[PDB]
Amino acid sequence: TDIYSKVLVTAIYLALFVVGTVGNGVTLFTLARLQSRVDYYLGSLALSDLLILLFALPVDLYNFIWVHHPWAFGDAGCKGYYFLREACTYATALNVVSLSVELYLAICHPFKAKTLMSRSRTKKFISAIWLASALLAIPMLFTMGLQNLGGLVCTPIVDTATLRVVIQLNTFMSFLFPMLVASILNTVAARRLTVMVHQATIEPGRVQALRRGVLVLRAVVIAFVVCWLPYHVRRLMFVYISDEQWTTALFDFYHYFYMLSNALVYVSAAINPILYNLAEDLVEDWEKARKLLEAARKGQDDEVRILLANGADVNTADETGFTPLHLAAWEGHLGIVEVLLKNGADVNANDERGHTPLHLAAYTGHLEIVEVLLKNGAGVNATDVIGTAPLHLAAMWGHLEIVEVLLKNGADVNAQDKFGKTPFDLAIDNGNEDIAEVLQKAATRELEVL
Numbered sequence: 171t172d173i174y175s176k177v178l179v180t181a182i183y184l185a186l187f188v189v190g191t192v193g194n195g196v197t198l199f200t201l202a203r204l205q206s207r208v209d210y211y212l213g214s215l216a217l218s219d220l221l222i223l224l225f226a227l228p229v230d231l232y233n234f235i236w237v238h239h240p241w242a243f244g245d246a247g248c249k250g251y252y253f254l255r256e257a258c259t260y261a262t263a264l265n266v267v268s269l270s271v272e273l274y275l276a277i278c279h280p281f282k283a284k285t286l287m288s289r290s291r292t293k294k295f296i297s298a299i300w301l302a303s304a305l306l307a308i309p310m311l312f313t314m315g316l317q318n319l320g321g322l323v324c325t326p327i328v329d330t331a332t333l334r335v336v337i338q339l340n341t342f343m344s345f346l347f348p349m350l351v352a353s354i355l356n357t358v359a360a361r362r363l364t365v366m367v368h369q370a371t372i373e374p375g376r377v378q379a380l381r382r383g384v385l386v387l388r389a390v391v392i393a394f395v396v397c398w399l400p401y402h403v404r405r406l407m408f409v410y411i412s413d414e415q416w417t418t419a420l421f422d423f424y425h426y427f428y429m430l431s432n433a434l435v436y437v438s439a440a441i442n443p444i445l446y447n448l449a450e451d452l453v454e455d456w457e458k459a460r461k462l463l464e465a466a467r468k469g470q471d472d473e474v475r476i477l478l479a480n481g482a483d484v485n486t487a488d489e490t491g492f493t494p495l496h497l498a499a500w501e502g503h504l505g506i507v508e509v510l511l512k513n514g515a516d517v518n519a520n521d522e523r524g525h526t527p528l529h530l531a532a533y534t535g536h537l538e539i540v541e542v543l544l545k546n547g548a549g550v551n552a553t554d555v556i557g558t559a560p561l562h563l564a565a566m567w568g569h570l571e572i573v574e575v576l577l578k579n580g581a582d583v584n585a586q587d588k589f590g591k592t593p594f595d596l597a598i599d600n601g602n603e604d605i606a607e608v609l610q611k612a613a614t615r616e617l618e619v620l
């Protein structure tokens with residue numbers, strides 16, 4: 171009797187329909203063309219959420235919101251509707267949990283993630299989820315059916331006791347237990363993730379990727395719970411409210427509660443593509459980073475420029491804490507080092523061992539890179555865990571030209587390490603007598619000031 175309510179809902183239903191159908195459609199079309207196991211889950215969700223908007227929404231809108239009396243889809247359409255709706259609630263829920271499980275494993279079992287996780291395994295698993303959802307939905311073919319009360323309505327055809335149990339079961343199996351598992355695992359994953367963040371002078375890329383996964387998956391569960399709790403609460407209310415005590419106050423309440431509860435289920439399907447965006451955006455950033463470290467190590471000068479331009483993180487590191495700049499200098503790719511520092515690479519970055527790019531540049535003995543790094547404000551007197559300054563390494567491996575370069579930029583010749591050895595001492599040890607003379611005079615000059 172409140173027509174505005176129905177009209178307002180129609181607008182929102184159509185809005186969620188037209189966009190949500192197109193959104194999930196495009197997501198499936200896009201995916202059709204290592205971590206391609208993510209895509210399978212996002213494809214699984216897209217499919218489940220598409221089917222709800224395409225088949226469930228329009229039937230719901232027509233024969234539950236507007237036209238109450240005559241059921242326009244017959245006995246098959248009645249049974250099918252409730253089957254395909256329940257199948258898709260299960261699939262979506264089970265997929266969302268599988269997602270939080272895969273993240274949890276990736277975080278809390280890195281060793282297992284490498285071995286256990288495989289494309290073939292995921293394909294077989296997703297097939298089981300859909301099949302599990304389909305089997306658990308069969309009861310809806312027998313529990314729901316047409317009744318005449320012209321007066322043809324898609325109402326339960328079993329006794330309330332039976333109906334209360336099948337739905338009570340579905341609510342546990344396709345929400346409560348799923349969300350329980352998910353929420354817990356995500357919290358355990360969040361607790362475990364903060365351990366690995368505490369290890370940080372490294373800043374690993376894989377950690378940063380997982381860090382984001384937790385944030386995305388936190389949103390997915392909070393989003394799923396708020397969207398699906400009202401729906402499940404209403405269906406539980408309906409089974410226990412099946413007595414003919416329907417006061418006009420209860421009618422009014424349920425009328426709006428039905429509209430709102432179902433609208434949020436369609437919202438949950440219409441936001442599904444946003445998750446795809448958040449996932450692909452996260453995975454692409456992770457992929458760009460790996461490629462940047464690979465290209466920097468490899469020396470693919472052309473690739474580096476591309477990656478940086480598209481938005482690859484210049485200050486990424488591997489498990490050990492080596493940034494692309496670190497590797498570029500180590501492999502002696504002057505052209506790359508110049509590009510990285512141009513795009514804003516951290517000149518004073520350290521690995522686990524405490525080695526700045528300048529350490530590795532001195533070790534190898536690439537004069538041109540050293541001069542570049544120092545121009546960009548490198549730490550001349552930067553020491554590692556052993557206590558080795560770059561001059562120590564330059565002197566030890568006999569790079570007299572680098573030794574002169576460093577001292578020019580204000581290198582401390584008097585610096586010592588854990589073994590107490592100065593660069594001059596390391597030159598004498600290694601037998602770089604020519605370099606030692608340069609350091610010998612350097613120390614004597616400083617004494618003259620005092």
Ligand SMILES: COc1cccc(OC)c1-c1cc(C(=O)N[C@@H](CC(C)C)C(=O)O)nn1-c1ccnc2cc(Cl)ccc12
Nearest residue numbers: 233234235238323325337405408409421424425426428429
């Ligand atoms: C058009 O719907 C009916 C027509 C005649 C009799 C009816 O109830 C016996 C129903 C019916 C069914 C439902 C309902 O919520 N059904 C559940 C069934 C499940 C518990 C299995 C669902 O689809 O989630 N709700 N529901 C409704 C009853 C009364 N007012 C309603 C107002 C609206 Cl806007 C929607 C459904 C209503």
